[PDB]
Scaffold this active site. Structure first.
Site, mmCIF file in Angstrom:
data_model
loop_
_atom_site.group_PDB
_atom_site.id
_atom_site.type_symbol
_atom_site.label_atom_id
_atom_site.label_comp_id
_atom_site.label_asym_id
_atom_site.label_seq_id
_atom_site.Cartn_x
_atom_site.Cartn_y
_atom_site.Cartn_z
ATOM 1 N N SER A 1 0.819 -1.208 0.000
ATOM 2 C CA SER A 1 0.000 0.000 0.000
ATOM 3 C C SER A 1 0.859 1.266 0.000
ATOM 4 O O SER A 1 1.406 1.643 -1.037
ATOM 5 C CB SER A 1 -0.952 -0.013 1.197
ATOM 6 O OG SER A 1 -1.760 1.149 1.213
ATOM 7 N N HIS B 1 -7.566 -6.128 1.321
ATOM 8 C CA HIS B 1 -6.427 -5.224 1.210
ATOM 9 C C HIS B 1 -5.229 -5.742 2.009
ATOM 10 O O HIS B 1 -4.129 -5.195 1.917
ATOM 11 C CB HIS B 1 -6.814 -3.817 1.686
ATOM 12 C CG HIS B 1 -5.757 -2.784 1.447
ATOM 13 N ND1 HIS B 1 -5.457 -2.300 0.190
ATOM 14 C CD2 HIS B 1 -4.921 -2.147 2.302
ATOM 15 C CE1 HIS B 1 -4.488 -1.409 0.282
ATOM 16 N NE2 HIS B 1 -4.142 -1.300 1.552
HETATM 17 CL CL LIG Z 1 -1.276 2.242 3.662
#
Ligand SMILES: [Cl-]
Length: 216
Positions: free
Chosen positions: A59, A188
């Site tokens: 991320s 995620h």
């Molecule tokens: Cl992040």
């Protein structure tokens, strides 16, 4: 250890999860822990030595690893042998959306990032300053990025099937090397799954070993 993996953590995980060592003697894993790129380039010198290395990022860490690589080429240093990016929407793509300025974000908007669990409302105020600063890093690592492939190292994208990151297939444009993408079961944070972790790890090792074959 043959290779050195430099891992870049996500927002929240105190660089702990990427404490992946003993495999058994392939990777000496060294983790980040949060023009800032200049501060990283000269800080990787004493640990890189002359040994080969690779970048992994998740991320937020994907943007940081990318610019750190991008910033190593600028100083005429050798790029990472491989750039592994996880769960990040590439800056130049149809799905990307610019991160607003700090002074244009409300605490409520900051609280939505912290979720990437919603029960925690009062705690957001104390986590607010850490989050805003992390966003400052990402806001910079996604600002003024070239529209031309600068990198030349190979690149693999990892992403979850239910992930909020999108169109990672477009990360291929940042380099002239070979671009691969793998879509794994999970959200995620698919990579927390001990199965996905084993898949990723093994793939990293194989990548670096093949890329380290003599040029004959
Ligand atoms: Cl992040």
């Amino acid at each position: 250890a043959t290779f050195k993996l430099i891992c870049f953590p996500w927002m929240g995980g105190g660089s702990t999860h990427f404490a992946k060592w003993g495999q058994d003697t392939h990777d000496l894993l060294e983790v980040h822990s949060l023009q800032l790129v200049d501060e990283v380039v000269c800080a990787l010198q004493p640990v890189i030595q002359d040994k080969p290395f690779a970048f992994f990022g998740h991320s937020m860490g994907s943007y940081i690893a990318f610019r750190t690589a991008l910033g190593l080429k600028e100083n005429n240093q050798p790029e990472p042998l491989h750039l592994f990016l996880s769960s990040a929407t590439p800056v130049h793509s149809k799905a990307w959306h610019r991160i607003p300025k700090d002074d244009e974000l409300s605490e409520e908007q900051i609280s939505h990032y912290l979720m990437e669990f919603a029960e925690a409302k009062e705690f957001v105020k104390q986590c607010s300053p850490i989050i805003r600063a992390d966003l400052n890093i990402v806001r910079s690592c996604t600002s003024n990025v070239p529209s031309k492939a600068v990198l030349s190292c190979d690149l693999t994208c990892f992403v979850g099937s239910e992930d909020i990151a999108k169109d990672m297939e477009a990360w291929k444009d940042v380099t002239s090397g070979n671009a691969k993408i793998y879509q794994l079961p999970g959200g995620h944070f698919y990579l927390l799954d001990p199965a996905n972790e084993k898949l990723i790890k093994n793939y990293i090792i194989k990548c670096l070993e093949v890329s380290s074959i003599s040029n004959f």
